[PDB]
């Protein structure tokens, strides 16, 4: 994944998730993508209520992108792998 500053364009399924979280732009930095992904998970309350580093994304469009039913914020590889599949570097 590109560093800080580099601009990326998300593929449509990911862009849609970011738009749900309030994103109005079409071009992002990776950190901005991560901001809106966190916003989305928070707004949709996909985090486990008792162990909140666990995200339950099954039965949500986010899980179709991540290809896993749950993940840990402390084990973010599925997130990064998804971003590599879904970000076009500009």
């Amino acid at each position: 994944l590109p560093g800080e500053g580099t601009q990326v364009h998300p593929r449509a399924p990911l862009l849609q998730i970011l738009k749900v979280a309030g994103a109005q732009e079409e071009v992002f930095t990776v950190k901005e993508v991560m901001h809106y992904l966190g916003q989305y998970i928070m707004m949709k309350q996909l985090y486990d209520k008792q162990r909140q580093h666990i995200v339950h994304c099954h039965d949500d469009p986010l899980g179709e992108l991540l290809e896993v039913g749950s993940f840990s914020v402390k084990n973010p590889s599925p997130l990064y792998e998804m971003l590599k599949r879904n970000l076009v570097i500009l």
């Binding site: 991560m34 966190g38 998970i41 928070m42 985090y47 909140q52 580093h53 995200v55 914020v73």
Partner: peptide
């Protein structure tokens, strides 16, 4: 007892 919002911000900035 950390919240999701604090946990994700740590990820985001790391």
């Amino acid at each position: 007892q950390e919240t999701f919002x604090d946990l994700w911000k740590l990820l985001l900035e790391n």
